[PDB]
Amino acid sequence: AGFDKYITVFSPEGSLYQVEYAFKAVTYPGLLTVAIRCKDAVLVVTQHLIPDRLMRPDSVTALYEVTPNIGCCMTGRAPDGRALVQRAREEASDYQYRYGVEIPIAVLAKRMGDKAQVRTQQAGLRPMGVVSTFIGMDQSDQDGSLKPQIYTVDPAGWTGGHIACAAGKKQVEAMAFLEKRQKSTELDALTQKEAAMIALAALQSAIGTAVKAKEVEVGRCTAANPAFQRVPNSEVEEWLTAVAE
Amino acid sequence: TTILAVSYNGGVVLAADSRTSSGTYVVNRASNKLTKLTKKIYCCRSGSAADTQALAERVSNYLGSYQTDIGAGVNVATAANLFQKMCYMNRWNISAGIIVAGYDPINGGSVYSIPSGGSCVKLDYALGGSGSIFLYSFFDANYKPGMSKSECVAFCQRAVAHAYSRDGSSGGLIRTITLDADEPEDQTIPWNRSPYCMEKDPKYVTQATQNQPFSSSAKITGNRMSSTG
Ligand SMILES: *[B]([O])([O])[C]([C][C]([C])[C])[N]C(=O)[C]([C]C1=[C][C]=[C][C]=[C]1)[N]C(=O)C1=[C]N=[C][C]=N1
16 A cells, blocks of 8 residues: 555555556657558558658668568657567567468457566566557458458557557547548458548648648558558659548 | 589579488488578478478578578578588488578579588589489589580480489489579479389390300390290
């Protein structure tokens, strides 16, 4: 009853205060990401803003490659996100050596949520103040096709699939735009051009700025080219004009 | 097993037979001794079928985990120092002759021959396997450096076909692949369309006159093919 909040100890209302304080390290940099999957692709947009003009803008990034078919964005404390990439690259490689096949995206999200649960149960270890968003396309069963996947793991360890997610500062106004857009159409029937307009407009409704094409970076995975790659900046400009239309 | 890798201007040409044989019996006549490490770097594979398969997929997982962390392409000299490290600290327990050949944009086409002793030598062409001892005097006479891509494919297919004609260990198909700045093109020509075989070699048509007829003279007149005459 002396501290109640300084190490991983249950509060008298049954909460962990080092979990609730690590959620606030996600919104503390002030950034934002939006992920969405269409019928045949996955998209991840994120705010890529450099305040200093003397900074090399192609070094600071949040989009990482875990395996050649899984990409991720790390929204939260930026050196903590680089730490969980190196953890996920070890787990995807040790899956490859031991089991011979590439790791499923739903399984790589589960094995990274088990790493976050241990750090919030042992008293000495600090939780990672970052929300991971592992995106990719899994091999479907009984037909052999590919299927878009989005998986998000909290700093507590809450893994789960998504149709469209958001993380960072004013992530509540980004969820509210996507649910309002969900009431009209059905997001698993839209195309890659149509779904790119929503994830960029959801990034506009929260920041209220209608940002430039260099102030974001977008990575994608498509059923034709299943490898994770980031888009060119010229293709973001073809999308930002359509949102203004 | 007869494996070889030859460099041209663009990239390299890997060439190998297809036969794993337990001493004297052909367990597999359609083996694949050309192992993919990365997209542009392969390795030829001779010796123990299990000891070299475990090395080839242990290097290929270090090499793909390296490529993701770097974010660029893997050099061939990088992949040839991961076989040398493993074939030297296991050299008393494995039987492994590896020829590593590939393509990188920095150095072009590279060929590394890693013998059973565990050394590493960078070459223009490499030979390996039990059938390679036939091909030293064949490359001393018939090989001229600086061929094109289409000439190195027809040469290495003609090179392997002279090797498994005399070797008992080697035989089967001829699996070749080229690794250069284009997409990797593979080609598997069979035995019955091989560029050389001793059965259709027109100087081995006449039987050696061993089974002489019972005659009155020392004049050798060929074999005895019938009971009457
Ligand atoms: B080649 O004949 O050397 C071949 C190379 C291998 C890496 C595909 N090796 C084998 O055929 C070996 C036998 C051998 C022959 C000559 C030298 C060294 C080894 N085959 C096997 O190891 C084997 C035997 N029985 C079952 C499975 N594998």
